Structures are given as structure tokens and as C-alpha cells.
Design a binder for these strands. Structure first.
Lengths: 1136, 216, 54
DNA sequence: TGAGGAGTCCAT
DNA sequence: GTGAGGAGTCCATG
């Protein structure tokens, strides 16, 4: 039977169940957002929830309401307009979560009632249950289908005539039948994956026009069973359940592979556990192929010289997008003699390879003792790499540098990719509208593939197909006119700039040539999220720790709040109060008599050595007992002794309790069979302590994922409600994060008469319980690492270092030192030592503790006394927290309060350090950018970008000395100051940028303020005052907390002021001015012509009596160059 | 990865009794060898040349029976005609018997039937797009040059007539553009051509076909 | 003419190195597979005998 | 010499 | 209708 939409004609589309306070927090911000911005916009809304209260219920109700609203919009449709169906996604990071969510949604649809009457009928239920699809990996999809489906699919497309396909299918069918032994499974999975790939490739290549087999009847059902993604394309279903990796990759239909990140217009995205999403995105971005820059450059230079495009209405306004790339490629080819190969020369270079690292803005390192050059020989037909001389090269560098070569190569490559993306977009725009012809899918997928192939075939090439197909998913959302631009006249951030890595070594087989590999990283997960929200998409994220202050274990909300703007919705105070009241009502610990006890444990050697001397009497000393019976060597004894003492103290304190029968231990290591001696030690210690005070104790050893998927976690729950005694289990922080739900139901006969309900009005068919004793150990190994290959680890480490530097937790000096030590080579312990000196470490530890304590109580039947045991290293940290304590659970507040009531010292605020570091970073970036721009300008000008940028910076600095709000366009020219209007500093403006100090630490340094520039005495002249109002310049410095950097106050502002003053005073009299030509740019101010005496004249200006101390040789050389350029001339030097 | 594949193959090996394990076992034993031998050859190429002695030499010789020919342990071989035209692997690379036959003795039984085998082997050659190859050669043979060293003596002189021919061909046939079909009756069926390079020529069209160059 | 490094071997030994060197120098590396199938000392896959269609 | 570990997709 | 009229095999590659 096939139901239809007609069954919903007579349905009360206004009756809705009674809303809950948690359900009213989602709908109102969205309603306000629709009124403020519009219908076509995106929003990110994190909701801080907790275990207990119905997070899943709320999310599934939201989904169901959206589905019903879509049905409503469809009923009154097909008569006034037509549009595609809205897409709703559910994304997490684990398969079990997807399965459980789908099952819960189906159960909720089936079993929902209102006012004692069922909400739906049978046909409506069956229609509602057919709009959802589930997309597993390609290996499981093949194993899900039956033999008949594959037989009909093969027969319908006439593929049984082939020999390879039949043999492979016969092998798979033979192997599948005996898939009971646990040895044939892995090969079956691999073969299934390969066969699925080949089969789908054949099916897709068959339906590319020509003999398009019509789909209808049993064949359509079989194909839809084999390929769930066809239902979305045809229009059967519009709700999908999938994981994050499959979301980033895509899925298949009968025409091509569909990438969900290319068309987000509309759509609703519900994401759970967003921090692990950040980590997964980072882990995915680090897997990418390298590239040989020399080969790519020599191919592009060769194939862009003569080949031409077609002049047709389809290909209009496309050829004009490639001229600058051609010109730059020609110049690059002629500058470095790309007609010869490359080779090394001399000793000490073949011993070790050469490595280079760059952050593309101001950080550069190199693993070379001396700078390496590049030389071209016209007698050997080669380009050579040589070390010049050890003692500073014994000369001046005039042959070239490797770093410049690498940088320009990378720039050209990225330019090519961007130009391709723009061209394809223009192609789709041109094709879709005009040219009435066979139109099937007027969208961005088929036009995408056709445009890519058509553009690549014309220009020969055809070797860059993989580099273009795999680069759209990340780089196609860039070029937002300010979103991504590396210039002083645009926003700059690491999250859309990236990094680079290069290695130079010999080729394979040959002993005369070298190559240059390169690994890139073009963005960060924060950029990906921002681009998801910018293209238009509604994202809902549910997490108890969404807005944390870790850039390593979470996103960067300071960047998102500065880029998105008003699209980052947040709750109000009254909504938080309502949520707190709702949580308090169902978790009313007070008014009932429930207490929480907190203790902190230290180490004690007498305890331990008494234990070993009592259980190993035949031995002499504790050390010998250790080495012989237990196995710990002499190098690492103290760590084991301390940890064991701290564990045994908690165990012994727990056993001697009358009314407690459950306890779990959260450690950092697994007590598997490898530590059987320690297991036996703890076992008989517990046995003796249980013999002391009469009670029965059971110990569980080895709680791992391999033990929770082969024995089961229901055994512990079953043993509790059938037998009497105590149980102690040992687990780890990471293991408890999977599986979850440590609950045992009921046994009143064996209960110790102490169990008290906590809710106010509740009735349940069944009752459960939770844990009543937890011991917490300090977390270890708080730094990310990757196991895939060797380059991914380096990329991850450099990303973490650069993120920490950009956030504000590190100074540039430490960042450069860390980068150099990592490039040369470091150990893990030395990497953790430098991380243990920041402020993110404490936040990460605190968040881990909060999450660990948050997942222990899920029921409303608790015990009167709850025991919590904590370490002392944690006590050092937990005493330092200052936030809103509203949604801080009940155990967390107890821990914080117990740690706080001890005095302790004070902590320096983060803001002061962050301000200092940000000022230093801004100064450094400005210095390097200005130097690079000046060096480029004094070469061949090329006009356009450089001159415009120079003039724009000059004009902006002239207009706005100080700004009130944080700027968005030119954010590298201003710094935040503690005092409003002026600040103090000291340092050298021609040396090391890592040697500057600011604010309090320099009270006798130089000063940047309004009086030093003496602008007051410059506006009193009669011929200069009206010029300022005519040009809109600022006659006074407004008092705001954002002032020019020291570099921009000396080398830019003074020259502009002097030039403007001299221009005003000379233009007041009978004088004329003009602009200088390109070749003499930056060597003079202007050109003056008057009275008909041509005799080309130029002038120079100085704001004050500046003594530049420039040698007369340079001035003479400039004058001679000017003379040989034109001839006789006159020169004027003016002070202002 | 190597351990994972080896463990899978070893586990699958122990249950090679029923007649459906054999096909899969053969088909993955055909892929394990490629990766293992490729890694072994790449390791021995230029660096970390691990010496062979003791039982390690015996193990490698058992795994690679063709290694014994290079050192000189044995100089008599048994193999079929298909394997003869392909070659066998040693520790360094693959050895082709047809590239060196000075002073050798070959015994063939049923010599007449080998014509069919050679014909079957000769007919698996891959195809090639002529336009792309000619354009690539014309593009890369314009400015690139070879080295001037004693080890590269009297090699450049062999490539001059090719350079003189390619530029004339490109100027005469306008290889700066692409190709397309125009008019009806040419979009529903492809065009096929055949020649014996000496005097036999046939075509698969009713009329003769012409090429044109358009400058607009 | 070089004997700078001791390698001995015959034409069968120094066969991959020459091809790789020439192809790398001439920027034609996509032809590597096509240049091995029909390669030998002289012929064996490209004509025989007179080697001239004249 | 400082620090001192498990867990998890998906494709070729 | 008008021609003529079927089993058998080696090896490499994800």
C-alpha cells in the first residue's frame, strides 16, 4: 500500500500538547530572530542542558513539529507556487547515538497521546514513518541487502554478462554464508567495500545518458533499498540521520556523489556534543595529499602560453578572468630561469634534508645553520643550491633566496584554484538562464561537474582534476570580500589563513635532481562553522559545557562573536532562572535530608610499607618486595607508591561504611592483565579490610570497551539486586564516555532501609538508582595527537601552537622558540611542560572534572549519604573559579565550596596578560607588513593594488587617530590601552620586534599622545585650517581606548601631516602640484610646474627637523638616477 | 597496515577446507605479494641496505626463487610461455629474459601452438589519445633543456629533428585549438578508421571527411 | 667513461635510472608507463628486420 | 629532563 | 529465409 498526503486533510493543525519551560527556550529566540534579521539567515544557538531533564525529548519534539509544519505547508501548496522540500539533519559522532535517536523518534511518533486520545491514526503514522532515512558506511549497506535485491539490480541493468563482476559476486556470496567464525569477518568487510565501489561506479557510468533505464516497480524499490540517497533526490524523504565523518564526505545517488556542504540554503542542523565535533573536524582536515611545486609551476607555465578558449555565448565573461595569472606566470618563468632543473651543491647538504615552515603572515623558521641561496649557471644548464660561506656569507646576498621561491609558488597555486572556482560559478550562471535546450537539473551539481571538465579540457591540463574536486568542499565558501584577504586593508586572522610545510630532498633513482613537497592547511574548524552559518543555515548545539574558555578542547567564541555579529543568539536571565527552577523542582536535594561529604587525600608511606610488611613477612624491606613480587623497577617507584597509597586510602575509607554498597574509581590507566601483581595486592588488601569489619565485598577488574562489548555492563546491575554485599569497580575517564547508563533497578528486600525520593510530584512504573561513592584522579596527557601517518601530527602541533598564540595566552618570543624546537625535534614531556604554564590547562581540567561528575546521577531515587573523594593536585586548581553558579549541578558546587574554604593566594587576572600579548603581536605584524610592502614598492611598481593600499592606509590613519569600537576592517593598526587616549612604551624601531614593553612595566619610556605630534600648533595657521575641514581630517584626538601602534605613529602619520601642511601652504599661494610617474615612486613627494619653465621639478618634505643621517652617497645616486631618467632638473627640500 | 593484511590472510588460511575459502584466499594472496615485494624493493633501493646472511638469506631465497639467478646459485629454470614474456622478480627489480639472450639455449615443446599464445599476449595493449599526447609533447619540447656533463654526452643531438618536426606540425595543423563535430548524421554514430600503414585503407562513412580551422 | 662510483652491472642494471633522469629533465613524467612496455635494447615490440618503410 | 593513555570513522 | 552450427586457459591488479 502507498499512502498519500490526502489523509491529513481533516486534522486539527492548531492543537498542541502543553509546552514545558525547557520547550519555550528554543521557540522564542527564533521568533525574535525572524523579526530582526529576516527569513533567509543563519543562527548559532548553544543550549546548556544536563542529564536528567529531557534533552532528547525536546529535540525530537522540535523535529516532529518541523515535519508537521512541512506537511501543513504542502497541503495548501501545488496551486500557488512550488519549491523543493526543506532538509533536516541529525548529526553526532557515534553510530549507537544515531540508532538510539532513530528508535526513540519512531517510538515517540507511535506512542504519543493528547487529552487521553491518540494524536495520530494508522495511515498517518505510516506516512510519517516513511520520511526518514539512515545512511551507514558502504561496507554495511552491502551486507544489509539480500540476494534477491542484488540479483534484480544486476539483471535489470544487464550486468550478469560480464565475467569479473560475476566472479567477485560469487566469491562474496560464498564467503557470506559462513560468516559465523570471527576470522572471516574482516576480509568480508574489505571485499564488500571494494565490490560496492565497483558496482556503484558501473551503475553511475551506465546512466550517463544514452540508455537511461527507466525506474519503476520492483526495480525502483530494490534500487532505493540499495541506495538510500536516491529517496532524497526524487523526493520521497527529507529527514536524514548520519554521523559527522559521513557528513563531511557525502553520499551517493544514481547520478553522482552529493556533497551536503555545497547547498545549505535553508536546512536545519541539530548537533550533539559539539566539542568532539570540533576535534573530529580538526582530525579530518589534517589528512591531505602533498604537491610538487616545481612540477606544477612548470606545467602551468607551459600550458598557459598558447592554448585558447572558445568564443561562444556559453563561455562569455570567463576568458577575462585569467589574464593576470598568465602575466604573473610569464614573469615568474622569466625571472628564475625555469628552463633548467634544480640540484644541490657542496657538503653538509646531502647529509640532512632542508625544512621550512611559515604561518604566511609574520612567523618564519628554517632548519639550516646558514641561509641558503639559489644560483643559475649558463655553462652547466642547472640551478644550484649552495651555502655560500659560513662567516655571514663573506658578501651581500644578491643571488636569491629559497623562501621567496616557495612563497611565490604557493601564492600562484592558490590563485589558480580560486580563479577556477570563480570561472565555474560564472559558467553555471550563464548556462542556467538562457540557451533553451534539454534541461534536467538546473542546480550546482551537474553544472559543477560539466563546467570543471569543459574548462579543464580546453586548457589541456587534466592532471588537476583531483586537486579541484577535493578543494571545493573547504575553499568554495571563501572569497567573501573581506572574509579572507591577506592585506593590511582587510580583516586578518589565523582561522582563515593557515600554515605551510615544505621539504626538499633527492628524487627516486636519479642522483641529479631535487623536488619540493608541500603540505597545506587552508582553514580551521572555527572557519568551517562560520562559513556554515554564513551561507545560511540554522544550527542547534546541545552541550552542558558549550561556552567554555578552552581554544584547544573547544571552538573560539571570541572569533565567532566578532565575525557573526548579531547572528549568535543567547539566552536571557529570566530564561536561565526558569531552567534553574525546573531543574530544582525535579532535583530538590534539600527539604528532604540528603547530604554531600567531600574530602581530599594525600600520600602516606607508613600506610603502604606497613601493608607490604604485613603481607610479605618473609622479605626484609619494602623496596625488595616491590622489585621482586610487584615488578616496578628502581627508576619510577615514587609515582607508583603515591598513586597506590592514595587509592588504598579511599578504598579503606569506603569499606568501613554501614549503608553504602557501590563505588567506582576513575583513573588514567587500565588495570588489565599486565598489572596482575598490583591487582592481587589491591585484592587481598580489600579482602583483609572486609574481614576486619563484617561485610561482603566484590571487586571487578578490567572494565574496558573490549569488556563492555563482550561480557556486558548489565552484569553489575544484575548482581546488585539479587545478592548482598558491596561492589567496587575500576574504570578510566575515556572508557566511561561510551555505553553510559550505570543503573541497577530495585531490590527492597536487600536494601539497607535508606532510600529517599527527591522529586515533588512523580509516578513511574519502574524505579532505578545510581552511584553513591566516587573517587576522582587528576587527568593526564592533555594535548592532542594524531596516529595517521607522520605529517598529520606535525600539522596538529603547529595548529595548536598558532591557535594558542592568536588567542592571547602566549607571547611571540615563546611562540617562536616553541616552533623552532618543534621543527628541530622535541619529546612529548617537553611539549607538555610548556603547555602546563598557561591558563587553558586549568580550564580543561575543570571541564573534565565537571563532565565526570555530571554523568553519575540519572535517577531520582538517591541515598542519604554520598561520599566524594578527590586528590590534592585538583584541590590546587578547583579553588580558582569565578562564574555564575546557577547551572553548576549539586556536586560541583560542593567541591568548589570545600576547596575554597582554605585561604590560599591570589591569581593574576587574564585580561592584563592578554592585552600585553595582543599589543606585542599587533606591533610585530605591523612592522613586518610595512617592511615587506615598502620593499615591494621600491621594485617595479605594477600599480593597482600596492599604490591603492598605501594611499588607503595613509588616508585612514589621517582620518581616524583613535576609534571608539573595535574595528573590523583595519584591525592590525590599533591596540587596546589601559588608559584612554595615551600609553607608554619603549623599544627599538630598527631591531628585534620581540623586545618591546608597554604600560606599567615602562614608566619612564617614550609617549604616544596628542601633544607630542603638536597638532594644536599646526591648525592655527590661516592657510591650513580650512584644508582640514575640506578634506574631513581630524583636528583633535577623541578620548577612546584604541590608539595607533608605535610603528604607525612614527613612520606614517608624521609624513602625511607634513605633506598635507606643505601642500596647503604652497597651494594657498600661486603654485601647482601633480603626481610623479611610476619609476620614481616613493623617491619624491610630488611634481611642480609653473610659469612655463618645464625643467622637471620634484620636492621632498619633512614634518620636523628630522636628521635621517642618510649618507650623501644615496642622495647623489638618487639625483643621478633622476638625471639620467630625464636630464636637467631642479630639486627642493622643505621642512614644515 | 602490513600487519593487518597479514593477520587477515593468516586467519583466513587456517580454514581453507570448504571450497569457497579458496577463491578469496587466492584473490587476496595475489594482492599481498605486490605490496610486500614493492616495499622490499623500495627499502633496498638506495639506503638501509640490510645485509643478507644466515637463515635470512634462505628465507628470502625461498620467498624469491628468482633471486638465486643473480648471485649465481642456479642457472637452470622451468617456466611457461606466459611467465616468460613477463619476467620474474628479484631483490632489486624485475628481470626480463627477452632483453638479454646472448649465449642461451631454449627448448620448446609444441612450438606451433605458441603462435596463438603470443597473439593473445600482444592484443592487450592500452589505447592512447593522440591529440593530448601531441599537444603535450609540443608544449614541453619548446624551452626545456638537458644538462652539459660527461655522463650526458652525445644525447642532445638525437632530439633535434623531433623538435624541428613538432613545431612545423603544430603550425600546419593549428594545435592551439580543440576539435568538435558539426552537422547532422555525425552525432548518433561514431567514426571508425583502419589502415595497414602501407597500402590498405578503409573508412566507416559513406562520404569522405574533412577538417577545417575557424578563426572566429 | 665515468667509473666514479663502483656499480659494475650491465645495460639491464642501469636501465631505470636513465629513463627516470631523462623524463625528469624533459618534464615528461606521465609517459613513464608507456615507455616501459615497448622498451628493450632494440625493438621486440616495435617492428623488426629492415626497420624502414622505404 | 622534563612527564609518566584509551577510543574511534571511512575510504581506497 | 541465408550464411554455419563451441570448449579451454595463464597471469596481473584494490
Amino acid at each position: 500500500m502507498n499512502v498519500s498526503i490526502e489523509e491529513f486533510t481533516h486534522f486539527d493543525f492548531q492543537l498542541v500538547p502543553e509546552p514545558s519551560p525547557l520547550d519555550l527556550v528554543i521557540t522564542e529566540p527564533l521568533k525574535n530572530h525572524i523579526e530582526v534579521n529576516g527569513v533567509k539567515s543563519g543562527a548559532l544557538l548553544p543550549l546548556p542542558f544536563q542529564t536528567g531533564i529531557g534533552k532528547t525529548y525536546t529535540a525530537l519534539n522540535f523535529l516532529l513539529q518541523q515535519m508537521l509544519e512541512q506537511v501543513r505547508s504542502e497541503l495548501k501548496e501545488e496551486n500557488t507556487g512550488k519549491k523543493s522540500k526543506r532538509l533536516l539533519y541529525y548529526v553526532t559522532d557515534s553510530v549507537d547515538n544515531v540508532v538510539s535517536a532513530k528508535a526513540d523518534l519512531l517510538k515517540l511518533i507511535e506512542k504519543q497521546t493528547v487529552k487521553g486520545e491518540p494524536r495520530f491514526t494508522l495511515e498517518q503514522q505510516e506516512y510519517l514513518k516513511a520520511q526518514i532515512v539512515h545512511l551507514p558506511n558502504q561496507s554495511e549497506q552491502l551486507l544489509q541487502c539480500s540476494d534477491a535485491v542484488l540479483n534484480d539490480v544486476l539483471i535489470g541493468f544487464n550486468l550478469n554478462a560480464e565475467r569479473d563482476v560475476q566472479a567477485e559476486w560469487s566469491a562474496i556470496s560464498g564467503l557470506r554464508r559462513h560468516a559465523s567464525n570471527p576470522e572471516v569477518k574482516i576480509s568480508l568487510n574489505r571485499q564488500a567495500g571494494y565490490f560496492y565501489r565497483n558496482l556503484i561506479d558501473r551503475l553511475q557510468k551506465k546512466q550517463k545518458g544514452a540508455d537511461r533505464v527507466l525506474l519503476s516497480g520492483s526495480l525502483l524499490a530494490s534500487v532505493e533499498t540499495l541506495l538510500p540517497g536516491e529517496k532524497i533526490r526524487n523526493g520521497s524523504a527529507h529527514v536524514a540521520f548520519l554521523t559527522t565523518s559521513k557528513f563531511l564526505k557525502g553520499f551517493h545517488n544514481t547520478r553522482s556523489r552529493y556533497s551536503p556542504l555545497r547547498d545549505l540554503s535553508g536546512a536545519v542542523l541539530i548537533i550533539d556534543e559539539i566539542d568532539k565535533q570540533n576535534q573530529v573536524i580538526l582530525s579530518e582536515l589534517c589528512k591531505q595529499q602533498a604537491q610538487d611545486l616545481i612540477w606544477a609551476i612548470r606545467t602551468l607555465r607551459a600550458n598557459f602560453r598558447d592554448h585558447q578558449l572558445e568564443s561562444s555565448p556559453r563561455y562569455d565573461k570567463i576568458e577575462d578572468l585569467f589574464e593576470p595569472l598568465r602575466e604573473r606566470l610569464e614573469e615568474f618563468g622569466t625571472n628564475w630561469n625555469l628552463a633548467f632543473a634544480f640540484n644541490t651543491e657542496g657538503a653538509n647538504l646531502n647529509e640532512r634534508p632542508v625544512r621550512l615552515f611559515s604561518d604566511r603572515s609574520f612567523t618564519h623558521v628554517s632548519s639550516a645553520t646558514h641561509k641558503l641561496s639559489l644560483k643559475s649557471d649558463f655553462l652547466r644548464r642547472k640551478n644550484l643550491i649552495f651555502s655560500d660561506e659560513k662567516v655571514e656569507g663573506s658578501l651581500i646576498e644578491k643571488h636569491g633566496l629559497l623562501t621567496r621561491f616557495v612563497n611565490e609558488a604557493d601564492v600562484i597555486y592558490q590563485w589558480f584554484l580560486g580563479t577556477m572556482r570563480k570561472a565555474v560559478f560564472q559558467y553555471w550562471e550563464n548556462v542556467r538562464g538562457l540557451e533553451i535546450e534539454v534541461r534536467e537539473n538546473r542546480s550546482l551539481e551537474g553544472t559543477f561537474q560539466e563546467a570543471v571538465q569543459s574548462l579543464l579540457t580546453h586548457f589541456n591540463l587534466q592532471e588537476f582534476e583531483s586537486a579541484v574536486y577535493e578543494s571545493f568542499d573547504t575553499r568554495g565558501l571563501r572569497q567573501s570580500a573581506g572574509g579572507k584577504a591577506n592585506k593590511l586593508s582587510s580583516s586578518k586572522s589565523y582561522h582563515h589563513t593557515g600554515l605551510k610545510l615544505v621539504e626538499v630532498a633527492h628524487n627516486q633513482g636519479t642522483r641529479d635532481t631535487v623536488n619540493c613537497k608541500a603540505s597545506f592547511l587552508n582553514t580551521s574548524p572555527s572557519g568551517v562553522l562560520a562559513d556554515m552559518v554564513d551561507a545560511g543555515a540554522v544550527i542547534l548545539g546541545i552541550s552542558a559545557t558549550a561556552r567554555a574558555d578552552t581554544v584547544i578542547h573547544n571552538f573560539d567564541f571570541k572569533y565567532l562573536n566578532e565575525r557573526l555579529g548579531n547572528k549568535l543568539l543567547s539566552l536571557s536571565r529570566e530564561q536561565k532562572q526558569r531552567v534553574n527552577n525546573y531543574y530544582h523542582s525535579r532535583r530538590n536535594y534539600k527539604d528532604n535530608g540528603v547530604v554531600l561529604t567531600v574530602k581530599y587525600l594525600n600520600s602516606r608511606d607508613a600506610f603502604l610499607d606497613a601493608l607490604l610488611e604485613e603481607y610479605k613477612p618473609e622479605a626484609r624491606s619494602s623496596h625488595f618486595i616491590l622489585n621482586h613480587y610487584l615488578g616496578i623497577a628502581e627508576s619510577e617507584q615514587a609515582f607508583v607508591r603515591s598513586w597506590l597509597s592514595k587509592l588504598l586510602a579511599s578504598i579503606k575509607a569506603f569499606i568501613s561504611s554501614p549503608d553504602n554498597r557501590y563505588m567506582l574509581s576513575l583513573l588514567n590507566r587500565t588495570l588489565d592483565t599486565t598489572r596482575q601483581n598490583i591487582n592481587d595486592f589491591i585484592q587481598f588488601c580489600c579482602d583483609k579490610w572486609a574481614k576486619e569489619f563484617n561485610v561482603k565485598t566484590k571487586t571487578f577488574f578490567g572494565v574496558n570497551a573490549d569488556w563492555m562489548r563482550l561480557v556486558g555492563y548489565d552484569e553489575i546491575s544484575k548482581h546488585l539486586n539479587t545478592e548482598l554485599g558491596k561492589v567496587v569497580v575500576f574504570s578510566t575517564y575515556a572508557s566511561m564516555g561510551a555505553g553510559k547508563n550505570p543503573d541497577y533497578a530495585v531490590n527492597l528486600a536487600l536494601e539497607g532501609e535508606s532510600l529517599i525520593s527527591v522529586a515533588d510530584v512523580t509516578y513511574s512504573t519502574q524505579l532505578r538508582s545510581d552511584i553513591d561513592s566516587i573517587y576522582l584522579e587528576k587527568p593526564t596527557q592533555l594535548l592532542l595527537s594524531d596516529d595517521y601517518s607522520h605529517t598529520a601530527n606535525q600539522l596538529c602541533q603547529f595548529h595548536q601552537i598558532l591557535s594558542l598564540q592568536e588567542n592571547g595566552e602566549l607571547s611571540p618570543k615563546s611562540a617562536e622558540n616553541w616552533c623552532r624546537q618543534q621543527l628541530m625535534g622535541m619529546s612529548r614531556e617537553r611539549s607538555l611542560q610548556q603547555y602546563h604554564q598557561t591558563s587553558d590547562y586549568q580550564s580543561a581540567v575543570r571541564k573534565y572534572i565537571e563532565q565526570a561528575v555530571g554523568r553519575a546521577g540519572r535517577t531520582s531515587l538517591k541515598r542519604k549519604q554520598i561520599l566524594l573523594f578527590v586528590d590534592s593536585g585538583l584541590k590546587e586548581i578547583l579553588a580558582e573559579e569565578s562564574r555564575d553558579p546557577s547551572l553548576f549541578s549539586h556536586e560541583y558546587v560542593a567541591l568548589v565550596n570545600k576547596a575554597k574554604s582554605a585561604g590560599k593566594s591570589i591569581v593574576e587576572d587574564r585580561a592584563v596578560r592578554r592585552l600585553f600579548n595582543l599589543a606585542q603581536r599587533n606591533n610585530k605584524d605591523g612592522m613586518l607588513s610595512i617592511k615587506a610592502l615598502v620593499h615591494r614598492l621600491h621594485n617595479q611598481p605594477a600599480s593597482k593594488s600596492d599604490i591603492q593600499e598605501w594611499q588607503d592606509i595613509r588616508t585612514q590613519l589621517l582620518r581616524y587617530p583613535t576609534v571608539a569600537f573595535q574595528p573590523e576592517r583595519f584591525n592590525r593598526l590599533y591596540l587596546q590601552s589601559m588608559t584612554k587616549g595615551y600609553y607608554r612604551y619603549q623599544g627599538n624601531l630598527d631591531g628585534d620586534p620581540n623586545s618591546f614593553e608597554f604600560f606599567d612595566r615602562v614608566p619612564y619610556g617614550d609617549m604616544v599622545s596628542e601633544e607630542d605630534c603638536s597638532l594644536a600648533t599646526l591648525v592655527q595657521n590661516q592657510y591650513v585650517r580650512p584644508w582640514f575641514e575640506r578634506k574631513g581630517f581630524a583636528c583633535s584626538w577623541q578620548k577612546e581606548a584604541n590608539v595607533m601602534t608605535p610603528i604607525m605613529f612614527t613612520n606614517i602619520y608624521k609624513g602625511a601631516l607634513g605633506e598635507q601642511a606643505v601642500e596647503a601652504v604652497l597651494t594657498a599661494f600661486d603654485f601647482t602640484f601633480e603626481e610623479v610617474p611610476n619609476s620614481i615612486y616613493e623617491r619624491f613627494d610630488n611634481r611642480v610646474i609653473f610659469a612655463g619653465i618645464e625643467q622637471p621639478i620634484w620636492l621632498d618634505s619633512k614634518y620636523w627637523k628630522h636628521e635621517g643621517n642618510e649618507s650623501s652617497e644615496g642622495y647623489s645616486s638618487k639625483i643621478a638616477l633622476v638625471e639620467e631618467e630625464f636630464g636637467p632638473s631642479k630639486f627642493i627640500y622643505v621642512n614644515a
